[PDB]
C-alpha cells in the first residue's frame, strides 16, 4: 500500500513564514515552480524566528518523511534570504539524531545553478515521534508516503 | 520435477564507491552460473546413453 | 595509559548529551566542551549536541 497524506498543513502550521517559494531551475511549462512534496521556507518582514514542529505517528503503518537542507552560494545570498550569518538544522526521533550545518562556498555551475540541496530520508515505526528544530536553511516536509510491506528496466511496451 | 522454484530477484546496483561489493556479487553470480551448466550438461549426457543401452 | 601487557585491550568510554542548556550550565559550568581521544591510529573529536528530545 502507498497511501499518501499530509504531515503538515500548508495554510495552518506556518503562520509567520512565507510558504511561497519558487526557482527557475525547476521549470514547468515556462512558469517556475518547485517540487510537489517539499515546502520551501523563507523569511518575511526581515525575520526568520526559530521554529519547532513535532509529529506523532498515530497511524499503524511506517512513515517515510523526506526533508532537505539548502546551501547558499555566498554569504550575501544567505544574509539576504535568512537574515542570519549562521544557522543549524536538527532532527531528533526515538533512535535518530543529526545536526546539519549549511556550508557556504563557491561552487561550479551545474544546470545553470550555483546553490545546492541535500535530501535526506528516514523511517518512523508506529508509535514513534519526530521533531524538527531549525533556525535557517530548511526545506520542511509537506507529504509522506505511508507505505506497508523487484525493479527491472526495459523499453518494451505493455499489454 | 526434482527442482522447485521460488520468488527471488537478481538485479542489484551500487554507486561509484564500495566496488568490493560489486566484485563479490559478480564472483558469486559467475560461480553459480558455472556450477549449474556443468551439472546440467553431464546429466543429459549420461541419460541419453543409459536410455539407449536399456532400450 | 600505556598498554603494558601481552594481550589486546578493549576500552569503552562515552559522551553525555544534556537535555537542555540549563543542565549544561549547571553540571559543568560551561557552554561548549570537546571530548577527544587520540591513539597510534585512532583520533576523533566528539561534541555534545544539546537539543530537546522526545522522552
From TrEMBL, chain A:
List of glycosylated residues: 16, 50
Domain of life: Viruses
Protein name: Hemagglutinin HA1 chain
Whole-protein residues included: 127 to 289 of 565
Amino acid at each position: 500500500s502507498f497511501e499518501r497524506f499530509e504531515i503538515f498543513p500548508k495554510e495552518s502550521s506556518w503562520p509567520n513564514h512565507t510558504v511561497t517559494g519558487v526557482s527557475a531551475s525547476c521549470s514547468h511549462n515556462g512558469k517556475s515552480s518547485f517540487y510537489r512534496n517539499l515546502l520551501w521556507l523563507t523569511g518575511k518582514n526581515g525575520l526568520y524566528p526559530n521554529l519547532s514542529k513535532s509529529y506523532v505517528n498515530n497511524k499503524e503503518k511506517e512513515v517515510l518523511v523526506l526533508w532537505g537542507v539548502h546551501h547558499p552560494p555566498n554569504i550575501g545570498n544567505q544574509r539576504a534570504l535568512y537574515h542570519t550569518e549562521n544557522a543549524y538544522v536538527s532532527v531528533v526521533s526515538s533512535h535518530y539524531s543529526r545536526r546539519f550545518t549549511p556550508e557556504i562556498a563557491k561552487r561550479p555551475k551545474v544546470r545553470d545553478q550555483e546553490g545546492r540541496i541535500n535530501y535526506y530520508w528516514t523511517l518512523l515505526e508506529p508509535g514513534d515521534t519526530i521533531i524538527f528544530e531549525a533556525n535557517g536553511n530548511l526545506i520542511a516536509p509537506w507529504y509522506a508516503f505511508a507505505l506497508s510491506r523487484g525493479i527491472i528496466t526495459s523499453n518494451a511496451p505493455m499489454d | 520435477e526434482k527442482m522447485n522454484t521460488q520468488f527471488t530477484a537478481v538485479g542489484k546496483e551500487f554507486n561509484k564507491l564500495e566496488r568490493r561489493m560489486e566484485n563479490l556479487n559478480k564472483k558469486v553470480d559467475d560461480g553459480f552460473l558455472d556450477i549449474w551448466t556443468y551439472n546440467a550438461e553431464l546429466l543429459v549426457l549420461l541419460e541419453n546413453e543409459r536410455t539407449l543401452d536399456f532400450h
